[PDB]
Write a protein that binds this ligand. Structure first.
Ligand code: CLA
Ligand code: CLA
Ligand code: CLA
Ligand code: CLA
Ligand code: CLA
Ligand code: CLA
Ligand code: CLA
Ligand code: CLA
Ligand code: LMG
Ligand code: PQN
Ligand code: SF4
Lengths: 89, 645, 617
């Protein structure tokens, strides 16, 4: 039970109807937590990748894909430049 | 010759191209009263003091003139309960709503305490005040231009100066005021309270009046002399007579052969004397502010609530300002002295004293504001029994609730003054102590780190007022003693604002409580202050927001002026924020663009537009901040206490 | 190790995301990876909201009675609550239109919400995977074509979940059919549809398909315009970032305006608090994005631009004219708005409200009547009444709105003045001719040359952010008071008392704080106690910002030196702490200014949020 505060809550008479049951049970909450744990593992991987930066051999020892080769050659998709610009064209 | 030298500062400003800037004008204003060390420094100081005395005499004459001509002083005499107004407002623009302005300076009560019953007496006092101001101006002129050098008054003739002030000025003035009381202020109040008409005051000096009508020397006179408005004047007369006697006796029974200013230069001696004098005057102002409502001394004073509030708040503000200026001039004297070896123990315990004061301030702040925030949190969480209140954990100020002692024929002030204190009083008193300690911390730090510090080791070479030493050492802004006074002024503003808030809420709470009716005798808590001044939310709701109704709903009423000054004070305070948060360089570049715009149109001012210097900008911001905050509190207090009392 | 000072923290943390200075991940692939990580964080934040709405929330009870139920955000389990407060509180209520959005986009169950949370977590995992492998190949992803395709797909979703989709005959299988068949899911009715009091889902779906197709066409046109006249002469991450931030700020401010006036979420206007919070929040976000566009323009000037005879070179050459004219505009607007407000204050105070200077906003009234309104409300410009009018929530302006809009213009022009002045003086002023060699942010140039406080280009943003917050406060006060008067049916208290600023105090701020302050008192505490507590907390943060802005370093450095002396001289601790490890030093001048600004704006935002909640609750 709540003590209403604010003129509009009293005037409009909106009631905070609590659902009878919970809504997510416990099994589906566990599944959400598992998926969040996988996302956390991926986030740890991303953090380790970004903190130590990109190693110099990759992008230098790994040959560019033919798509990347042709894009850099023709200057597309932000290449032939020094910007990111996700909203390029 | 003299007229030529009157604008000599401006002539020197325009003589050199380096001084053809607006910064030169601001320096000319800032260095106006900064009388440089010279053979005539003492002459200049004394003449300036006498000129200020003349200015104050002009002010007193104007106040008595308004009482004589533009006041309902006679109507107030016939009925003290009416609103004392002493400022007529002409019908220009549309300001006619506020035509009678209720003056809260207490001049009506003062004049009644002086035996003044006719506006002719006020006219005479105004005329004599103008005459005294003219005499003071003549004397100041004379001393500045033709008199002794006065350089011996602080070091050589300090014994003569101190003895004259002790006996002549203080003691003889108190004795003369006691005579005035006993002879014309007591009899006039007797004949006014009894309503038996008042003769000319000189007719009381006839040796045939009540002086010899009855020789009885106690509380017994014609009919029934039971006036309790009159007894405070009797006590004041006795106090002045006793004080004159003790001053005269102790002056000749005192050594006075110890001048601590032998080791200080004349300029530094003057600054140190000014600092100690400012400390004494400020603490005296605070003491009077407390005693005004602590003890009734003026006729029909406590009844006029706006007057009581105004006197308390004004004298608290003046005391705080002068207490800050005390440390300001102590710092000036220390940093501007060649060999200030006298403060060796404190300049060698620099870090010890400063760090212990730092811990004291930290402890007091965390504890006091944590009591407040804890009460806020517990009340928000719905835990009123976990708060710090009387119905909860009680912080009873036990040290306040005891003054019992052996009587030895005493009375009245042998107790806690008949007032009980509670948790709210304890917490607000500790808030006051913490804020005072923080202001003192800033001021003492400015004094101690004035000649040298661990950061900058030659701060004495930088004088008293400098913006910084540079962005080096991580940044050295605001190291100057001037900047420490600048911050201490903000903290004094905070301290005095909280003090006057505490006083005003306690005063309103007591007024509401005594308005029980007569039958209502269980005030429980009630005492809106005692019940609500335990939370920051409690203050914000039941004091600021609650009492702001009077000042914000004043439009169309005589307090519309208070409402407008409330708004203007907020405006000035935000403008201060503008000056304090910003910096000189940006404004200089903006002025460069504006000056290009000027040059494009062949305007080209030669007094080159320069934005305010760093110290000048800080000073302007502080001035606006103090003006805005103090004006907001002024408008709020006056509207609240005049509309509701 | 760690033989640095505490200044190291605030020095690196201020540039911790200045990846251009981070030589390791300096490539644009790393910046795209940062974008992927940020989008993963956004997806997880939306998953948070959806998960707590579906877990402890009344969405199933909300779809049934959207007008009579208050949306629940999450369950409150604060151990500090007292049993009564525990019995008092049900759960944390909702201050955002996520219930309305979910209802609009076709959610009808908590199972759908749970699947949405799982999908959001999976998409965040996908974003993290994409960020794991930065690569020029991934730089191909994005573009206006991609965002237009996203718009088209959203149109498809809205078509699939439009209320009339049940009556829709399958177009791709039975042909397009009659026009009404398509009207079941694609409409252009225009304006509020009554009932839900929001734009029809068919309208939104049709809007999105049209926008996506037009965006595809516009992107193709822009790229053929890049075919001939192919000139990427100035490429900089800060130039493109400024472009994106300015466009995003314009779009977000437009979103606030057109979402108040044309709500797209069903039964949203019935919820006053969520509407006000939406408008205020989006306007703050838009102003922040525009300020960021200006900031990154200044940064591009500082360290990525080379002087040429181009657009920027022309702007720089006549920067004195720009700054001077902006200063004139701001001076005129401030002088006149402040003077008219003070005149109205004096007239209302002196009991003569008729003698106020009320300049009727005849130009905006002319625009409104001629272009927007379908009935004669003012009668100027046109008086025709529309035979078949459409509905919306466009406010009806009056005399006070003229002064308020002039205040808004003053705020915007002053903010632009500060930002443009700082950006263009990053190339140098006569007080600092060599600012091109000092970087975007620095303390000062010392006390010499009269003083050089706040002369840095970053200090220009620092000064202009106060003006950003002030302008947003001005027009959000305007919007909030206007909608409060409309909802409370006053509409005349506003139109009269907004002419003078004492009205803005008494009737808006002092009046609307009555319920908020009663959140908790001696009698007890109600549901507004949290917001009164946040009000006080925000005031405390604001005044701490005052501390960091007014008092400057040197004092504090000396005080910290004395505190270090106390520690080194203290017993039982000089054996353990020699101040060599993470030496405690006072905050640098730039760090202090930023932290003071941060406290100032944090208190600003939290104070206004608490006030909005306590006023429109
Ligand atoms: C303590 C300083 C002081 C202050 C603040 C004031 C303030 C005021 N005086 Mg005042 N006055 C003072 C000293 C002071 N007086 C002295 C010493 C005398 C004696 C000569 C007077 C004699 C005096 C008269 C005779 C009148 C005022 C009036 C006024 C009011 C309007 C002034 C005006 O019209 O400007 C005019 C200023 C100039 C023309 C510039 C010169 C104002 C409240 C007037 C008033 O209250 O009207 C109802 C009015 O008629 N004053
Ligand atoms: C920029 C803002 C602004 C503007 C446009 C005005 C304008 C006006 N104010 Mg006003 N005022 C302002 C700010 C402003 N004020 C501020 C900030 C305050 C607070 C202090 C006031 C307080 C105020 C009051 C209290 C009053 C006014 C009044 C007036 C009006 C009469 C002016 C008059 O006769 O002057 C007289 C001077 C002249 C006419 C100049 C002489 C003519 C020139 C020299 C001719 C030159 C040759 C061509 C006028 C419309 C009055 C009013 O009610 O009128 C409606 C009035 O009583 N004002
Ligand atoms: C009985 C004689 C007498 C009396 C009534 C006064 C009275 C006064 N003197 Mg004074 N004085 C006296 C003798 C006297 N003096 C002598 C003999 C000397 C020479 C040593 C001085 C040297 C002196 C100085 C140097 C100053 C005063 C000042 C003052 C005034 C303020 C005092 C104050 O606040 O503390 C201080 C006050 C009107 C002060 C003032 O306001 O000057 C006008 C001030 O600066 N007096
Ligand atoms: C007995 C009182 C007294 C005396 C004689 C002095 C004397 C002096 N002080 Mg000092 N001071 C005092 C009290 C006093 N102070 C107090 C109480 C404070 C704390 C607030 C200070 C703080 C202080 C600082 C911080 C400094 C001085 C300085 C000085 C010296 C130069 C002053 C100067 O040029 O100002 C010229 C006069 C002015 C600038 C007056 C301008 C008006 C002020 C700034 C604001 C007034 C606003 C007004 C009240 C509101 C307007 C009305 C409104 C309705 C619009 C001089 C020796 C300076 C120095 O270098 O000393 C060597 C200096 O830097 N003082
Ligand atoms: C600084 C001021 C202050 C003070 C004195 C208190 C006091 C209290 N709070 Mg509290 N609180 C504060 C600020 C403060 N609060 C603030 C700012 C907040 C907001 C975050 C809160 C939020 C809060 C909550 C949420 C709760 C409390 C509670 C409490 C109570 C129990 C706390 C506890 O466990 O003590 C722990 C105490 C210690 C560990 C001891 C520290 C003090 C020792 C004695 C110092 C000794 C120094 C020594 C003399 C040095 C010399 C030694 C030498 C001679 C050898 C207590 C009455 C609880 C409650 O409801 O109780 C009523 C509770 O649930 N507080
Ligand atoms: C997508 C948009 C975007 C992007 C990619 C960037 C990217 C960048 N900006 Mg930038 N900026 C943006 C928008 C953006 N900005 C906007 C909108 C503004 C205007 C507000 C700015 C204003 C701005 C300035 C002024 C500066 C940058 C700088 C930078 C660069 C370094 C960032 C850094 O390390 O900061 C460090 C980041 C932080 C320290 C974050 C602060 C943490 C916040 C304040 C926490 C406070 C919230 C707290 C939880 C609230 C508590 C409430 C309380 C009640 C409890 C980097 C390239 C810097 C630069 O390039 O200089 C060379 C720089 O000086 N930006
Ligand atoms: C802009 C495009 C867009 C967006 C943002 C959405 C968003 C949504 N749709 Mg949807 N939809 C779209 C286009 C879109 N739709 C189109 C074009 C159609 C027609 C074919 C549909 C048909 C549709 C149906 C039939 C349903 C939804 C539902 C939903 C909701 C939950 C879906 C979810 O996450 O769980 C499903 C997804 C996952 C569990 C995992 C995500 C899939 C991959 C792994 C991530 C994608 C990465 C991304 C593309 C980059 C969510 C609000 C559901 C709902 O309840 O809404 C009311 C639902 O039942 N949609
Ligand atoms: C209430 C507080 C306040 C006020 C009034 C101002 C006012 C101003 N700021 Mg500002 N500022 C503030 C707080 C404030 N600031 C804060 C807290 C910050 C953060 C540090 C800033 C940061 C800032 C920057 C960074 C810049 C400004 C600028 C400006 C100016 C903009 C031009 C303008 O509007 O002229 C109008 C002027 C006023 C409204 C001042 C009041 C003037 C009078 C009293 C009002 C009018 C009365 C009447 C009409 C005059 C009568 C005439 C005759 C009868 C005598 C103006 C002087 C810009 C600037 O200088 O450009 C020119 C600029 O670049 N400010
Ligand atoms: C509600 C949210 C509103 C509050 C957030 C408002 C913040 C305003 C946005 C401005 C952010 C950009 C400013 C910036 O990065 O530069 C602001 C400055 C820029 O960094 C400064 O750069 C200078 C040279 O460019 C020098 O190197 C200074 O040493 C360095 O501090 O950053 C700092 O001062 C950071 C110090 C504070 C760091 C504390 C981290 C807080 C994390 C807690 C979460
Ligand atoms: C605005 C500003 C300036 C610029 C201030 C200047 C150039 C002073 C000149 C202002 C003129 C003199 C104002 C004149 C008075 C006004 C017209 C208002 C008074 C009169 C009205 C009430 C009618 C600084 O120089 C500065 C320096 C250091 C820190 C902060 C700041 C700062 O904030
Ligand atoms: S910011 Fe100003 S006061 Fe501080 S060090 Fe730099 S120039 Fe000096």
């Amino acid at each position: 039970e709540r003590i209403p505060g604010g003129k509009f809550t009293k005037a409009q008479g909106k009631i905070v109807a609590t659902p009878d049951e919970d809504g997510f049970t416990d099994s589906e909450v566990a599944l959400a937590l598992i998926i969040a744990a996988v996302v956390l593992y991926l986030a740890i991987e991303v953090t380790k990748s970004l903190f130590y930066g990109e190693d110099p051999e990759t992008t230098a020892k790994g040959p560019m894909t033919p798509f990347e080769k042709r894009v850099v050659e023709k200057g597309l998709f932000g290449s032939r430049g020094d910007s990111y610009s996700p909203f390029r064209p | 010759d003299f007229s030529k030298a009157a604008f000599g500062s401006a002539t020197g400003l325009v003589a050199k191209a380096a001084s053809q800037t607006t910064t030169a004008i601001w320096n000319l204003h800032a260095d106006a009263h900064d009388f440089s060390n010279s053979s005539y420094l003492s002459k200049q100081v004394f003449a300036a003091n006498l000129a200020h005395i003349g200015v104050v005499f002009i002010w007193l004459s104007g106040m008595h003139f308004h009482g004589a001509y533009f006041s309902n002083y006679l109507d107030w005499l016939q009925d003290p309960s009416i609103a004392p107004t002493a400022q007529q407002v002409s019908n220009i623009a549309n300001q006619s709503v506020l035509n009678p302005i209720r003056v809260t300076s207490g001049f009506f009560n003062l004049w009644l305490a002086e035996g003044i019953t006719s506006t002719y007496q006020l006219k005479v006092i105004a005329a004599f005040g103008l005459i005294a101001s003219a005499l003071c101006f003549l004397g100041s002129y004379f001393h500045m231009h033709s008199s002794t050098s006065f350089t011996r008054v602080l070091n050589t003739k300090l014994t003569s100066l101190s003895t004259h002030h002790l006996v002549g000025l203080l003691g003889l003035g108190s004795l003369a005021w006691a005579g005035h009381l006993i002879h014309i202020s007591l009899p006039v109040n007797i004949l006014l309270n009894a309503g038996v008409a008042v003769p000319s005051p000189h007719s009381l000096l006839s040796s045939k009046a009540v002086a010899t009508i009855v020789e009885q020397l106690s509380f017994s006179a014609l009919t029934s002399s039971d006036g309790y408005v009159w007894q405070p004047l009797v006590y004041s007369a006795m106090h002045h007579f006793a004080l004159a006697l003790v001053l005269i006796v102790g002056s000749i029974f005192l050594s006075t052969a110890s001048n601590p200013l032998m080791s200080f230069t004349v300029g530094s001696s003057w600054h140190l004397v000014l600092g100690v004098q400012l400390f004494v005057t400020g603490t005296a102002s605070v003491l009077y502010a407390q005693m005004s409502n602590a003890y009734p001394v003026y006729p029909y004073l406590l009844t006029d609530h706006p007057t009581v509030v105004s006197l308390f708040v004004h004298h608290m503000w003046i005391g705080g300002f002068f207490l800050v200026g005390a440390f300001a001039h102590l710092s000036i004297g220390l940093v501007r002295d060649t060999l200030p070896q006298s403060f060796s123990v404190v300049l060698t315990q620099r870090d010890i004293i400063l760090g212990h004061l730092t811990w004291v301030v930290a402890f007091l702040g965390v504890h006091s504001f944590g009591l407040y925030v804890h009460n806020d949190t517990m009340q928000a969480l719905g835990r009123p029994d976990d708060m710090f209140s009387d119905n909860a954990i009680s912080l009873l100020p036990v040290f306040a609730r005891w003054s019992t002692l052996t009587l030895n024929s005493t009375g009245s002030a042998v107790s806690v003054l008949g007032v009980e204190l509670s948790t709210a009083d304890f917490m607000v008193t500790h808030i006051h102590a913490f804020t005072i300690h923080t202001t003192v911390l800033i001021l003492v730090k400015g004094f101690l780190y004035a000649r040298s510090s661990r950061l900058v080791n030659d701060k004495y070479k930088l004088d008293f007022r400098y913006p910084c030493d540079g962005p080096g050492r991580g940044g050295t802004c605001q190291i100057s003693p001037w900047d420490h006074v600048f911050l201490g002024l903000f903290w004094m503003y905070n301290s005095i604002s909280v003090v006057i808030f505490h006083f005003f809420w306690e005063y309103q709470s007591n007024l509401a409580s005594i308005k029980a009716s007569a039958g209502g005798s269980i005030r429980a808590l009630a005492s809106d202050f005692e019940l609500n001044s335990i939370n920051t939310n409690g203050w914000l709701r039941n004091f600021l927001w609650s009492g702001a109704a009077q000042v914000i709903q004043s439009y169309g009423s005589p307090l519309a002026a208070y409402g407008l000054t409330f708004l203007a004070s907020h405006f000035v305070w935000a403008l201060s924020l503008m000056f304090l948060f910003s910096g000189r360089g940006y404004w200089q570049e903006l002025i460069e663009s504006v000056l290009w715009a000027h040059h494009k149109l062949y305007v080209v001012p030669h007094i080159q537009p320069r934005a305010l210097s760093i110290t000048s900008g800080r000073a302007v911001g502080l001035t606006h901040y103090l003006l805005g905050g103090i004006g907001t509190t002024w408008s709020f207090f006056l509207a609240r206490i005049v509309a509701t009392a | 190790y760690g033989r640095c000072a505490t200044q190291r923290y605030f020095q690196v943390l201020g540039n911790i995301h200045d990846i251009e200075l981070n030589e390791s991940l300096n490539s644009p692939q790393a910046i795209q990876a940062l974008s992927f990580g940020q989008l993963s964080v956004i997806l997880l934040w939306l998953a948070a909201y959806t998960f707590h709405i579906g877990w402890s929330g009344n969405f199933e009870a909300f779809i049934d009675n959207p007008l009579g139920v208050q949306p629940i955000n999450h369950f409150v389990l604060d151990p500090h609550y007292s049993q009564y407060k525990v019995d008092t509180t049900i759960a944390a209520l909702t201050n955002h239109p996520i219930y309305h959005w979910l209802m609009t986009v076709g959610f009808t169950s908590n199972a759908q919400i749970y699947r949405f949370t799982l999908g959001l977590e999976i998409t965040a995992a996908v974003m993290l995977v994409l960020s794991l492998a930065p690569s020029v190949g991934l730089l191909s992803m994005g573009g206006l074509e991609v965002v237009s395709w996203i718009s088209i797909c959203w149109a498809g979703h809205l078509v699939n979940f439009a209320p009339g989709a049940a009556n829709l005959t399958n177009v791709v299988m039975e042909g397009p059919g009659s026009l009404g068949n398509l009207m079941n899911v694609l409409t252009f009715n225009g304006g509020i549809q009554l009932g839900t009091q929001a734009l029809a889902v068919s309208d939104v779906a049709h809007h999105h398909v049209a926008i996506g197709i037009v965006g595809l066409w516009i992107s193709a046109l822009l790229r053929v315009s890049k075919y001939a006249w192919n000139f990427n002469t100035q490429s900089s991450y800060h130039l493109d970032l400024s472009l994106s931030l300015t466009v995003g700020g314009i779009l977000t401010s437009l979103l606030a305006q057109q979402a108040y006036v044309y709500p797209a979420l069903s039964y949203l206007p019935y919820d006053y608090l969520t509407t006000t919070s939406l408008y205020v929040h989006h306007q703050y976000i838009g102003a922040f994005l525009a300020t960021g566009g200006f900031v990154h323009g200044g940064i591009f000037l500082v360290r990525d631009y080379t002087l040429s005879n181009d657009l920027v070179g022309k702007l720089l050459a006549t920067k004195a004219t720009v700054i001077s004219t902006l200063s004139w505009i701001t001076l005129f607007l401030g002088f006149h708005a402040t003077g008219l407000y003070m005149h109205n204050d004096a007239m209302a105070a002196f009991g003569v409200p008729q003698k106020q200077i009320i300049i009727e906003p005849v130009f905006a009234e002319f625009i409104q009547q001629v272009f927007f309104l379908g009935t004669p409300v003012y009668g100027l410009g046109s008086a025709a009444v529309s035979s078949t009018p459409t509905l919306s929530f466009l406010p009806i302006i009056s005399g006070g709105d003229f002064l308020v809009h002039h205040a808004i213009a003053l705020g915007l022009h002053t903010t632009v003045l500060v930002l443009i002045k700082g950006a263009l003086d990053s190339q140098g002023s006569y007080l600092f001719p060599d600012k091109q060699s000092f970087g975007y942010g620095f303390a000062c140039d010392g006390p010499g040359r009269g003083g050089t406080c706040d002369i840095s280009t970053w200090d220009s943003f620092y000064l202009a952010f106060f003006w950003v917050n002030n302008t947003v406060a001005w027009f959000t006060y305007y919007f909030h008071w206007k909608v409060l008067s409309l909802w409370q049916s006053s509409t005349a208290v506003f139109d009269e008392n907004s002419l003078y600023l004492m009205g803005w105090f008494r009737d808006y701020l002092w009046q609307n704080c009555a319920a908020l302050l009663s959140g908790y008192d001696s009698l007890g505490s109600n549901d507004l106690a949290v917001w009164a507590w946040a009000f006080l907390l925000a005031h405390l943060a604001w005044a701490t910002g005052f501390m960091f802005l007014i008092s400057w370093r040197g004092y504090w450095q000396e005080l910290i030196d004395t505190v270090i002396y106390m520690h080194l001289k203290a017993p039982f601790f000089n054996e353990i702490w020699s101040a060599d490890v993470v030496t405690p030093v006072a905050l640098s001048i730039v760090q202090a200014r930023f932290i003071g600004l941060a406290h100032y704006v944090a208190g600003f935002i939290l104070t206004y949020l608490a006030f909005v909640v306590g006023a429109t609750s």
